[PDB]
Design a protein around this ligand. Structure first.
Ligand SMILES: [Ca+2]
Ligand SMILES: [Ca+2]
Lengths: 69, 69
């Protein structure tokens, strides 16, 4: 169960995204930071144990205006 | 280049750890959440691109009283 989140600032977005997951009490298994080029832009790939956790994350991140897949 | 951090609250500690990394402007490549039992205790395994980033992270987390390896 994976969710991919496009981000403009890998470092700051990582902190914001994990604070959102914490507030919603969503457990994750892994967080991978992907990039096509060196620089601050990237994709956060978040892995979950359960489908329910992925959907909860998708909703919460969507509400904070992150584009998610 | 990996750093292992013991935590008491996987969900909240993940947010705290990434906020510290943000404060120090440290980029990471991966974060894996490991647990021995279902429940809040665990170990965060953090991967870095460079040795300098690992050491910077180790120092900053140490200063916030996390036990690190
Ligand atoms: Ca609660
Ligand atoms: Ca700062």
């Amino acid at each position: 169960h994976d969710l991919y989140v496009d981000v403009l600032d890998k470092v700051g977005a990582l902190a914001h995204v994990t604070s959102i997951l914490a507030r919603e009490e969503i457990s994750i298994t892994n967080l991978q930071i992907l990039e096509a080029r060196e620089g601050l832009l990237g994709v956060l790939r978040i892995s979950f144990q359960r489908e329910e956790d992925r959907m909860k994350a998708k909703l919460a991140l969507g509400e904070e205006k992150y584009q998610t897949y």
